[PDB]
Write a protein that binds this ligand. Structure first.
Ligand SMILES: Cc1cc2nc3c(=O)[nH]c(=O)nc-3n(C[C@H](O)[C@H](O)[C@H](O)COP(=O)(O)O)c2cc1C
Ligand SMILES: Cc1cc2nc3c(=O)[nH]c(=O)nc-3n(C[C@H](O)[C@H](O)[C@H](O)COP(=O)(O)O)c2cc1C
Lengths: 187, 186
């Protein structure tokens, strides 16, 4: 099969599905977020991609903090709703049970399986988006999501996202041991 | 029940599974990469998070270019191999069939399902990792991975990753229409 040139506007296959929390004018906001990735190993840093058109960036700029929150699959609707409406027009502070942590100002979602509380280290600006690089200063889960002290993805049952087809997916079958199977081909 | 604090070195659940391609000293190199995200809508830009201890950043730094390649699930072994061995000591240029694009500087993998050829726009440095921001200037797939010229993830069959438990996963079942199912709560 020959290689075909396609539209340059391609998204990652798949994206994760997260809820991004920020205080904006003292009130908790949440937006749906798929543009999240680790950036730095030590200290542990992630980055978050946010359109300049959204309400959320004002809050992240104000507070220098944000959270990354992982819903389970049964929260699909509330999650999607947070990616359909803006905090500019619609109060999203009441949709979830909100808790705060050490940074005081990054609102986190009680119902989410995992919450990463982040301190803005650097705000990167690109033509249509900010990418807020944050240090993970505290991480929260619950015992029922952990195996040997660490998050277990099957317990979490997180969502996945694909655009512009606009689909949600869940995690499928185990597919091998990472940093392991490749050793089979070594030396 | 109650929230409990766990260790701060937390990865995204799950990560994507990608092969990062660069020329180093005129020779193709590939590493496994889960630290990638889109960073700008228009023009299309992604960012890649790369340890300073790796061989690949030397190549991206030389060339001002790199590629992002999506293996399908049957490629797990060679993919993990690329995440274990460094081009510093082990030549990885022959592991896969390599093709180049418009830039002629960023090596892409024929066997992969989707190849993104990227021009570095901005390079950031953090204490242990570079963060290279690239513009997607060319994107390559095959008819067999496409619906109306658009990648279909089930045809692609890409790998997912979780760490530090170090598990690969594939994609599961359709779970709803994004930017749609949530319309009910309005
Ligand atoms: C599943 C999903 C993922 C999304 N991911 C992002 C993203 O990564 N970055 C972004 O800027 N917008 C993203 N959006 C769109 C925003 O969440 C949406 O416009 C939201 O209403 C912004 O909220 P706000 O105005 O209160 O900040 C996503 C939407 C959906 C439904
Ligand atoms: C599946 C998996 C994902 C990985 N993701 C990243 C990553 O996102 N960033 C990074 O710096 N290293 C990552 N690594 C580690 C590098 O891929 C690995 O150290 C590789 O051997 C580097 O090779 P190089 O020295 O030729 O660049 C990953 C490893 C595995 C197996």
């Amino acid at each position: 099969a020959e290689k075909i040139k396609i539209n340059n506007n391609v998204f990652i296959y798949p994206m994760p599905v997260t809820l991004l929390g920020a205080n904006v004018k003292g009130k908790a906001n949440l937006m749906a977020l798929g543009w999240v990735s680790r950036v730095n190993a030590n200290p542990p840093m992630l980055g978050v991609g946010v359109n300049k058109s959204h309400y959320t960036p004002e809050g992240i700029a104000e507070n220098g903090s944000f959270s990354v929150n992982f819903p389970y699959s049964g929260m699909v609707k509330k999650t999607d709703y947070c990616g359909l409406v803006s905090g500019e027009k619609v109060d999203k502070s009441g949709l979830f049970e909100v808790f705060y942590g050490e940074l005081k100002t990054a609102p986190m979602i009680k119902e989410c399986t995992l919450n990463l509380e982040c301190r803005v280290v650097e705000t990167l600006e690109f033509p249509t988006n900010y990418f807020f690089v944050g240090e993970i200063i505290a991480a929260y889960s619950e015992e029922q999501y952990l195996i040997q002290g660490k998050p277990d993805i099957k317990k979490m049952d997180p969502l996945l996202l694909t655009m512009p087809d606009n689909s949600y997916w869940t995690v499928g079958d185990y597919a091998g041991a990472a940093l392991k199977t490749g050793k089979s081909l070594m030396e």
